[PDB]
Amino acid sequence: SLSTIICIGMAGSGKTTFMQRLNSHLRAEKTPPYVINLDPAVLRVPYGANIDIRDSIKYKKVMENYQLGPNGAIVTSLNLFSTKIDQVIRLVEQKKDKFQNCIIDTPGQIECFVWSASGAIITESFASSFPTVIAYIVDTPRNSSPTTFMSNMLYACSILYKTKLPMIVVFNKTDVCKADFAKEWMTDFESFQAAIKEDQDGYMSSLVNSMSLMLEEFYSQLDVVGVSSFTGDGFDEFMQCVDKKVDEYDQYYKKHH
């Protein structure tokens, strides 16, 4: 019965803080999740994790023993973990009627998780055993430039395609910067064309014009919410987007896994 929520997003966008607040929110609803941390580099985890990659794998140690830098040691830790993925999935399976959701925190860097073989295997394993939803975390205060916003959205699209999972775009940190502008840009594309024309010269506008149709087709697939992981604002709405995406998953997405 359990569904899996995988938090994915740019470093510093708030994945871990979002995870903490989601956890407290679900517990307050008397539906505490099963919590997994897959960031091997993190120093302390500000919530209780049921499975922590750092337990089986000592991140500094893999750095030293394998002689690689940050990105390498993160991906190596993920490889080692992915070795035990069958066991992990079975563990979650045992708990699948005791917990409404399994929620998963990922490495800080998005590409360490979705463009590594091992991260893709981990994701595929979860997708193949439970309804699984990608919560794509957006650092809202940093995406006010229309070109930055659009690049970020193209990236989310590529992730949507790569993972073949339903996506919820989560504009985080609304306590600093509200997400109205972005919702509008995704809803009324002529506003985005206006922002682009003002901000950027010429060809961009024209480019963005054709992309209007393409982007609209992307945005229709998404669910979209604004949250503050500091205040807990918007999380009820996120969980509604989760239930919707679990439904869609059943119909549309289950066939791909």
- What is the binding site for its own copies (CB under 8 A)? 10-11, 109-111, 115, 139, 142-143, 145, 147-148, 150-152, 154-155, 157-159, 161-162, 200, 202-204, 206-214, 217
Q: Quote the least distance from Cβ 133 to its own copies, whole Å.
A: 20
Placement of tokens 């922590």 in the chain = 52
If we measure between CA atoms, which residue out of 146, 142, 163 comes closest to residue 221?
Answer: 163
Question: Mapping DSSP to helix (H, G, I), strand (E, B) and coil, where does residue 126 land?
Answer: helix
Placement of tokens 């394998």 in the chain = 66
What is the rounded distance in angstroms from the CA atom of residue 125 to the CA atom of residue 111?
Answer: 18
Q: Sign of torsion, CA 235 43 148 118?
A: negative
173 annotated binding-site participant:
yes
What is the rounded distance in angstroms from the CA atom of residue 150 to the CA atom of residue 134?
Answer: 19
Taking CB under 6 A as the rule, does residue 230 contact ligand GDP?
yes
Among 4, 100, 132, 229, binds ligand GDP (CB under 6 A): 229
Q: Which does 66 bind (CB under 5 to 8 A by kind): ligand GDP, its own copies, Mg ion, none?
A: none
Q: Which does 229 bind (CB under 5 to 8 A by kind): ligand GDP, Mg ion, its own copies, none?
A: ligand GDP
Task: Note the residue count of the chain.
Answer: 257
Ranges within 102-161 binding ligand GDP (CB under 6 A) = 108
Q: Which does 17 bind (CB under 5 to 8 A by kind): its own copies, Mg ion, ligand GDP, none?
A: ligand GDP
Placement of tokens 């959205």 in the chain = 153
Shorter beta-carbon distance to its own copies: residue 121 or 204: 204
- CB burial class (10 A; 0-12, 13-18, 19+) of residue 111? middle
Binding residues: 12-17, 172-175
**Interface residues with ligand GDP (CB under 6 A)?**
9, 11-17, 108, 172-173, 175-176, 228-230
Binding residues for GTP: 12-17, 172-175
